[PDB]
Each structure stands twice: as C-alpha cells, then as structure tokens.
Design a protein around this nucleic acid. Sequence first.
DNA 1: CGGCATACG
DNA 2: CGTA
DNA 3: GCCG
Length: 327
Amino acid sequence: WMPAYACQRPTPLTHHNTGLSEALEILAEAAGFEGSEGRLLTFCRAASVLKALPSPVTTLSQLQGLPHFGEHSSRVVQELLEHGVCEEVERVRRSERYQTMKLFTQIFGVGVKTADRWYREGLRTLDDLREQPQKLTQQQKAGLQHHQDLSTPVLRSDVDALQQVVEEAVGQALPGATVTLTGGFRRGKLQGHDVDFLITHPKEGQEAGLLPRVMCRLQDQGLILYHQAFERSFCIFRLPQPGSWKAVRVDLVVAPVSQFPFALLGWTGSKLFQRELRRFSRKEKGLWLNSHGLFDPEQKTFFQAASEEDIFRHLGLEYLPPEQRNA
DNA sequence: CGGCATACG
DNA sequence: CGTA
DNA sequence: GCCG
Ligand SMILES: O=c1ccn([C@H]2C[C@H](O)[C@@H](COP(=O)(O)NP(=O)(O)OP(=O)(O)O)O2)c(=O)[nH]1
Ligand SMILES: [Cl-]
Ligand SMILES: [Mg+2]
Ligand SMILES: [Mg+2]
Ligand code: NA
C-alpha cells in the first residue's frame, strides 16, 4: 500500500511521525556531510515514507513491507520506540564534526566541500572565518555578514509585501510579466529559509533578457543587499521591519511561458519530491524531466504542457497539489 | 552489482 | 566551486 | 542504505 517513489504518494506538510522522520533526517544530513549521497538518499526516503503514513508508527512490525526500511533505518526507529532516543542519532547531534559542518554549510556561499576543507584546516566557528576574510569569496562574505538575519525564518506574513515590491519592478521591466510564489510557501509552509518567485510573460519570447532589467530596478530602489545574461538570481533583499529592516534571501527565476509548468513544478519542490519525480520519469517511463521540459529520448521530442496537471498525466501519475508534495 | 536529479551563476 |  |  506504499509505493517506492515519493512522487507516487501524497505527503502532507504536517503528519503523524514527526519525531521519527526528524531522527532519520539527521542521519541523512550527516551522510551528506561525509559525501555519501546514496546513504543520504536512503535516509531521506525512509523519513519521507513515514511522513506519508496515515497514523503514528507505534510498533516495529508496522515497518514491515515499507519501502526504504532495511536493517539500519528499522533499528533507528526501534530504539526511538523503545527508549525515546536513538544512540547513533544523539552521537551525531553532539559531534563536533556534525555541528561544525552544519554551521558552515548554513552560510550562503558555502557548500559541503568548502565546509569540509575549512573543518580539516581546524576552523570551527563563524568568528574563525571572520578573522581570515582573505579566504572568503564575495558571496561568502555577504553570507557571513548577513548570517544572523538569514538564520531567522521568513514568515508567510512577510511574503505578500515582498511579492508586491517584486511585481512593481517586474511591471516596469516588462509590462504584463507575472510573478508567481513558488518554493516551500507554495506547498503551504508558514515559514521558509527564503522566498522563491517564478517570473514569466504570456507572450512567448517577451521574457528574454528580463531578469537583468528586474535586478537593475530592484537595485535602483535600494532593496538589494547582495546579488551577483541570466535567468536565475539568488539575492539578499532588504525587508522592512518595525523601525528597521532585516536581510532576507530571495530567489528569482524567469521562464518562457512554454516552460512555465515545468519550472513551476520544479521550483515548487520539495527538493526530495523533485529528485524522486525525475528519477521516476527516467527509470520508470524512460523520459527525461527537468525545470525546462520533459524529453522523449527515443522520439527526440519534448512534451508540451499547459499545466502541472499535464505533466503528472504525461508521467502516468495521479495529480498531487503542492500541499501534498512535502516529501 | 549499479544507481542514486538535473540544471544555472 | 557556488546556487535552485 | 536500500531497490530492483
Ligand atoms: O537542490 C535543489 C534545491 C531546490 N530545488 C527546487 C525544489 C525546492 O523546493 C525549490 C526551492 O529551493 P529552496 O532551497 O528555496 N527550498 P524550499 O523553498 O522548498 O524550502 P526553504 O526555502 O524554506 O528551505 O527548488 C531543487 O530542485 N533542487
Ligand atoms: Cl552513500
Ligand atoms: Mg525556498
Ligand atoms: Mg530558494
Ligand atoms: Na551554504
């Protein structure tokens, strides 16, 4: 009753196995810090299966026949069920390696490879990085300066104000261009690490060259604290607060209207949902999916899609609204 | 055992 | 390398 | 780490 791919089942935002999924996601995250993508994937998938269940797991036998639960993930769940704690998970949580890789990778501009190199060099804290700013890219300097504000959740109640401001710049850049809220907030999240906006125009081709024009207008209005022909922009925005403001991460992406359904599907996530959807497409359907389109490598043809609904149908999957893509 | 999503800046 |  |  549980399909193996996350895109084959509804996954709501809130569920009945929160503590169990969070524990497996710690192990997934730690696998990622050690460069083990496959283990990261298995722990993420196992976590996701639990989010999709209709009630709490209370006994080990309820894991029988669930995909992605083998000896390791089952043992994690068993210890949590028996003791309220999994020793392996706690050991990871308090390790200096986990805590520091987590701290470093949280910085905008720093990925696993950079964090790891710094870790091997003996660096442990944000102050360690600040003291040697010679070793930092301009992106990382911005990420580090703004780190405190960027560690504060963006609130859904912030989002409408930002969208209006983006729409104003977009409207001047290209009348008729639209802004669509994507990312976690579109899946119903009440908080986020950033705000993701997808921009298009109803007349195919009119959107060419649009993003630089948008960015120049936003920067002219004094709203851009950081940004770097292009179609994706990862920036840090000045967001008004009572008597002051805070720095917020905002992503902008432009797609032609022909590709909009694919870009909307990709940017709406979740990240695991999209990886599973793409894996499903390729391995089960022999079709190649990305945020631009869906390709049949035998006919050498692209599927036209007018909606996300079209794409789920192309792939032979039941439609899932964004709120059920929280894999 | 091979495979693990797929792009753009 | 970073990023979504 | 797990599946197929
Ligand atoms: O590696 C990625 C990262 C993101 N994405 C897609 C799915 C994800 O939901 C979307 C937005 O990326 P974010 O990093 O902004 N994550 P999300 O908005 O889901 O949550 P949050 O921003 O609150 O962390 O882009 C990928 O496809 N691959
Ligand atoms: Cl691995
Ligand atoms: Mg986001
Ligand atoms: Mg984003
Ligand atoms: Na980072």
